[PDB]
Each structure stands twice: as C-alpha cells, then as structure tokens.
C-alpha cells in the first residue's frame, strides 16, 4: 500500500485510480466502500488491515498560457490551474 | 424448543428514501 501518491489501484475488485490517504471516515463494520453525493467511490477500507482510506481524483487543471502579445515578447508564463505546486 | 411471540412480513419491491447519518447508520426512511 502506498499513500499520498497517485496510483492506480484495485481493492477487492473495486478498482479506480486515486490518491489513497488516511481518513477519519469511520466506515461501518460490514461497510465496504464509501461513496458520495455524486455517487462516486470515495473512501475505502483496506481489506487486509481495516482502515479508512480516502480517495481523491488525480489532478486535472487546465493549462493556461499567459502571454504578453507575441508582438511584445516570446516569453510566456504557464499557469497550471487548480493544483498544488508539486506534480508539475 | 418444546416443553413467545413472533411475526412474519413479506418483502415487496418498494422504493424507499433512506437517510444515512454521519456515522453512516440509517436513521430514518420514507416509503
């Protein structure tokens, strides 16, 4: 098991791809998944050792390219929307 | 065990509106 790091995964045949973290989501004794208003798999519980892992989408973001008009420069400053600056 | 009430329903294909709670326990429902 790996944490805080985007991975593919399968749990118990539940699959998906996410960022598995440590979560206080108190799952029920017999409850397997979690889910969410949008009906999208969220928390899971590690089948072997029983614990509440979040999930989290990967990143997305657009990529916006800030530029002063090419008439002025050739220098652009990319903007990665909506990420924390690492995965760059 | 022979020398006490019990009941029987029958399940039907109703559609309910559950309501889970924070801990995740169904605390109510509406037929």
């Amino acid at each position: 098991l790996v944490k805080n790091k985007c991975v593919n995964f399968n749990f118990n045949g539940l699959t998906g791809t996410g960022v598995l973290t440590e979560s206080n989501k108190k799952f029920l004794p017999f409850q397997q998944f979690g889910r969410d208003i949008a009906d999208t798999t969220d928390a899971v519980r590690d089948p072997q050792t029983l614990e509440i892992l979040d999930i989290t989408p990967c990143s997305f973001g657009g990529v916006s390219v800030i530029t002063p008009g090419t008439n002025t420069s050739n220098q652009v400053a990319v903007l990665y929307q909506d990420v924390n600056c690492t995965e760059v | 065990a022979l020398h006490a009430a019990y009941y029987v329903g029958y399940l039907q294909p109703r559609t309910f509106l559950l309501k889970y709670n924070e801990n995740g326990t169904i605390t109510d429902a509406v037929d």
């Binding site: 029920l28 | 329903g9 309501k19 889970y20």
Partner: peptide, 25 residues
C-alpha cells in the same frame, strides 16, 4: 387464526455494503 398487527416502520436494512453519510439516498 392469524392475528394481524401493524408493522409500523420495521424492516429496513442496509441494502448494500456501501457507506454514505448525511445523504438521503
């Protein structure tokens, strides 16, 4: 003879193993 009576609200059960929270579903 069967003596009926009024089920009231009993008989609800977690239809699956999914977990949810605070979510009318």
């Amino acid at each position: 003879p069967p003596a009926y009576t009024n089920s009231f609200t009993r008989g609800v059960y977690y239809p699956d193993k999914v977990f949810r929270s605070s979510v009318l579903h």
